[PDB]
Design an enzyme around this catalytic site. Structure first.
Site, PDB file in Angstrom:
ATOM      1  N   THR A 100      18.545  -7.028  31.340  1.00 42.54           N
ATOM      2  CA  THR A 100      19.956  -6.771  31.048  1.00 42.54           C
ATOM      3  C   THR A 100      20.332  -5.296  30.958  1.00 42.54           C
ATOM      4  O   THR A 100      21.516  -4.955  31.033  1.00 42.54           O
ATOM      5  CB  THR A 100      20.388  -7.405  29.711  1.00 42.54           C
ATOM      6  OG1 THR A 100      19.525  -6.943  28.663  1.00 42.54           O
ATOM      7  CG2 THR A 100      20.318  -8.897  29.785  1.00 42.54           C
ATOM      8  N   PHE A 157      20.820  -5.629  21.767  1.00 45.54           N
ATOM      9  CA  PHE A 157      19.627  -6.355  22.224  1.00 45.54           C
ATOM     10  C   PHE A 157      18.334  -5.544  22.114  1.00 45.54           C
ATOM     11  O   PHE A 157      18.285  -4.390  22.537  1.00 45.54           O
ATOM     12  CB  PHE A 157      19.789  -6.796  23.685  1.00 45.54           C
ATOM     13  CG  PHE A 157      20.857  -7.837  23.908  1.00 45.54           C
ATOM     14  CD1 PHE A 157      21.102  -8.825  22.970  1.00 45.54           C
ATOM     15  CD2 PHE A 157      21.606  -7.826  25.081  1.00 45.54           C
ATOM     16  CE1 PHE A 157      22.079  -9.789  23.192  1.00 45.54           C
ATOM     17  CE2 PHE A 157      22.589  -8.783  25.310  1.00 45.54           C
ATOM     18  CZ  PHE A 157      22.827  -9.763  24.360  1.00 45.54           C
ATOM     19  N   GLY A 158      17.278  -6.175  21.600  1.00 51.94           N
ATOM     20  CA  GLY A 158      15.962  -5.560  21.545  1.00 51.94           C
ATOM     21  C   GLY A 158      14.892  -6.548  22.000  1.00 51.94           C
ATOM     22  O   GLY A 158      15.195  -7.721  22.213  1.00 51.94           O
ATOM     23  N   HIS A 217      20.699 -16.919  13.403  1.00 55.80           N
ATOM     24  CA  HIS A 217      20.539 -15.983  14.498  1.00 55.80           C
ATOM     25  C   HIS A 217      21.496 -14.815  14.310  1.00 55.80           C
ATOM     26  O   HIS A 217      22.707 -15.013  14.194  1.00 55.80           O
ATOM     27  CB  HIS A 217      20.792 -16.643  15.848  1.00 55.80           C
ATOM     28  CG  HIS A 217      20.779 -15.671  16.980  1.00 55.80           C
ATOM     29  ND1 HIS A 217      19.622 -15.062  17.422  1.00 55.80           N
ATOM     30  CD2 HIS A 217      21.785 -15.156  17.727  1.00 55.80           C
ATOM     31  CE1 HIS A 217      19.913 -14.237  18.412  1.00 55.80           C
ATOM     32  NE2 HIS A 217      21.219 -14.274  18.616  1.00 55.80           N
ATOM     33  N   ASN A 272      18.747  -7.522  17.901  1.00 51.93           N
ATOM     34  CA  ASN A 272      18.955  -8.887  18.376  1.00 51.93           C
ATOM     35  C   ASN A 272      17.944  -9.196  19.474  1.00 51.93           C
ATOM     36  O   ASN A 272      18.134  -8.792  20.625  1.00 51.93           O
ATOM     37  CB  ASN A 272      20.401  -9.057  18.883  1.00 51.93           C
ATOM     38  CG  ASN A 272      20.698 -10.463  19.429  1.00 51.93           C
ATOM     39  OD1 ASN A 272      19.806 -11.295  19.608  1.00 51.93           O
ATOM     40  ND2 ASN A 272      21.968 -10.715  19.719  1.00 51.93           N
ATOM     41  N   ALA A 319      28.892  -8.938  12.692  1.00 52.58           N
ATOM     42  CA  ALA A 319      30.167  -9.581  12.406  1.00 52.58           C
ATOM     43  C   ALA A 319      29.995 -11.093  12.216  1.00 52.58           C
ATOM     44  O   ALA A 319      30.662 -11.703  11.381  1.00 52.58           O
ATOM     45  CB  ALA A 319      31.169  -9.290  13.509  1.00 52.58           C
ATOM     46  N   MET A 374      29.759   1.718  18.051  1.00 55.61           N
ATOM     47  CA  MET A 374      29.103   0.422  18.217  1.00 55.61           C
ATOM     48  C   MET A 374      27.736   0.396  17.549  1.00 55.61           C
ATOM     49  O   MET A 374      27.382  -0.574  16.881  1.00 55.61           O
ATOM     50  CB  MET A 374      28.929   0.063  19.699  1.00 55.61           C
ATOM     51  CG  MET A 374      30.209  -0.205  20.466  1.00 55.61           C
ATOM     52  SD  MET A 374      29.826  -0.732  22.147  1.00 55.61           S
ATOM     53  CE  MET A 374      31.472  -0.919  22.829  1.00 55.61           C
TER      54      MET A 374
END
Lengths: 393, 389
Positions: free
Chosen positions: B196, B214-215, B302, B335, B307, B58
């Site tokens: 999260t 996510f960042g 965004h 992200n 993908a 991933m």
């Protein structure tokens, strides 16, 4: 010969011309209703706190002084029996509360919206914007998505989801709707506030009387308005024009009203004299809004004020020197619905137009031309919207 | 005084214009090459060997090089419930983000205000957006206080919107700036993944996707109509802003705020849904402008995941150059939810100037900004560049 489309040309063709106008108002409440006279006995029974005699005495006086006659509440004895952690003062219960309000908030919103849309009389497809406001729960996609789907609005309706806003946000949604309607030709904004106290309901504690204040005041309800510039008088019927909308933070008010969303749900805290703070500053808010319009007599305008509690209304009325009539619509909604947070001022707006018509006043603002709408909430925040009425036939 | 007189004087004249962009991140930084080892070490998950392998792939595929994270090993040690996959931890998470989100927002806003060069007292509106935590008064109040803005700044607090909301904040700022003479809008997105973050579980892999993508970051813009072009320096004009829900996308991206914190659930093919519908969004936005060549406009998208970008690129037939700024931000920041598209606007105007292009939009006059998120919701903002002067 012309050049290709320019940004200036787009902007000129894109904007609306006149003031944002309220064209319809619809309201809805849960069916379940509780008389305030009966609420201390009911509340202390279902929270199993009847042994807390002195506290129940305090709560009796709080309800007796609330100037509330009844409230509607989605929460029933049966629902609370299935959710015992909600009856404690601070037990883990957010998931249970969310499960309720993530469904019920947009459902109640739908009921108010359908009434507003029916009154308005235009196709649902003509709605261009949806503003949804609640202080009850949060979810992704939000209640705005849920409501748009429920109503069968166009997929490309422009949505704004206003979460966790608090009691001033009826003013906030009007302030938002104003700019959306005025800046966009043809825009018709559906703006909805929906509040359900299942997120704040909790049992009594001796060490937190301010939380019990909330248990005496807060009720459920939703209100929807249709807002647009440039009404088509052939088919639309203006009720109120918005003229200006401002928001401010009161001096020396830090922490006056705090609210936290925790594992025990939404908790409510009061730290300062809220009625004192508002009444001490309300005349400057009035001057800021009305001096540029050449208006100075606060008894010569109609009034819509968020009824946070009876003390706020009493102290504003006394400080400003308002005739008793000015707060009648506001106090009526407090009496018959209690404090429905953000939706309150929209209910009062509805009450104001309806009684004006019924009583044969010359305008939708009890015969007056100019009016003011106040939202009060965490900050301490004051929303001030200047209104203009419309003549009644 | 009549209402018509008030209205004519009250409204602004020209298009809402971005006048400054500032960005900030937490100091703590983690290389994506290191993250699977790190993540599986601190969550005490080394025994889940096949799962770690899946996570490694991933991160390998993510096209992210590094991310900034407020969360440190030291903070996580103090909050062990946050390291479980599902343990009660909302209060702990809230305690962190209710403070850190407006703090990070302040850093970004200070940079935007410095660039803008006008006094703080000239800011008339504040729009604050976050998907990380909620509180009353909101992060908007906290930021206004921290910056010492005027008490009567008009605030709008956008909570819990998710990844499309960089588009939303621009859509909101547009109407605020254009409808109000003199208005100068500070719009801020600030996202912190403490809400999260959770441990790995073999039974839900879509949750591990989030841990890979996510960042943290915040971005701030100043938006106003009718700029003083001597002292205010336009970067981009907004022309139109729309929002839509993609067909057959029910439940594609769900997020619920629970006692265990914020959970995310993917249920449909998000890159497929977006790429299938993106040409219609482009059409809806650009047809009224006489524009049809999607390689002739600059792009801000965004970066929900690689993908999405790859499949949009392939479907539309974009020259690889068009997604460069977007992919740069995904590479260097991951992200960052709502803040991403604002970082990308910043990247684009900066690289445009460095490259000696004729406009802030890589030499092109028109551009598009896309937000993607729960709905499935697509925000489409049409932009116009400014000639570089």
């Amino acid at each position: 010969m012309a050049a290709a489309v320019t940004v200036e040309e787009v902007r000129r063709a894109q904007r609306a011309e006149g003031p944002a106008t309220v064209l319809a108002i619809g309201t809805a409440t849960p069916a379940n209703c509780v008389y305030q006279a009966d609420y201390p006995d009911y509340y202390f029974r279902i929270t199993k706190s009847e042994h807390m005699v002195e506290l129940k005495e305090k709560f009796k006086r709080m309800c007796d002084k609330s100037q509330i006659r009844k409230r509607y509440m989605h929460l029933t004895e049966e629902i609370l029996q299935e959710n015992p952690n909600m009856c404690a003062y601070m037990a883990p219960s957010l998931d249970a509360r969310q499960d309720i309000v993530v469904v019920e908030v947009p459902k109640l919103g739908k009921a108010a919206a359908q009434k507003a849309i029916k009154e308005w009389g235009q196709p649902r497809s003509r709605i261009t914007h949806l503003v949804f406001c609640t202080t009850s729960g949060v979810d992704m996609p939000g209640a705005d998505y849920q409501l748009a789907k429920m109503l069968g609005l166009r997929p490309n309706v422009s949505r704004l989801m206003m979460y966790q806003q608090g009691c001033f946000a009826g003013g906030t949604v009007l302030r938002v709707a104003k700019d959306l309607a005025e800046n966009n030709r043809g825009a018709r904004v559906l703006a909805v506030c929906s509040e359900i106290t299942a997120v704040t309901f909790r049992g009594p504690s001796e060490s937190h009387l301010d939380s019990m204040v909330g248990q005496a005041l807060f009720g459920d309800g939703a209100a929807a308005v249709i807002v647009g510039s440039d009404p088509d008088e052939a088919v639309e019927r203006p009720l109120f024009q918005m003229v200006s909308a401002s928001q401010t933070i009161l001096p020396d008010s830090e922490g006056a009203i705090d609210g936290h969303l925790r594992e025990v749900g939404l908790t409510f805290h009061l730290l300062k004299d809220v009625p004192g703070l508002i009444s001490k500053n309300i005349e400057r808010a009035l001057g800021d809004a009305f001096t540029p319009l050449g208006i100075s007599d606060w008894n010569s305008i109609f009034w819509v004020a968020h009824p946070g509690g009876p003390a706020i209304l009493d102290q504003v009325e006394a400080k400003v020197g308002l005739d008793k009539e000015r707060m009648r619509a506001t106090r009526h909604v407090l009496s018959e619905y209690g404090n429905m947070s953000s939706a309150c001022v929209l209910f009062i707006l509805d009450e104001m137009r309806k009684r004006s018509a019924e009583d044969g006043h010359a305008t939708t603002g009890e015969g007056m031309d100019w009016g003011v709408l106040f939202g009060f909430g965490p900050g301490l925040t004051v929303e001030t919207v200047v209104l203009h009425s419309v003549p009644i036939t």
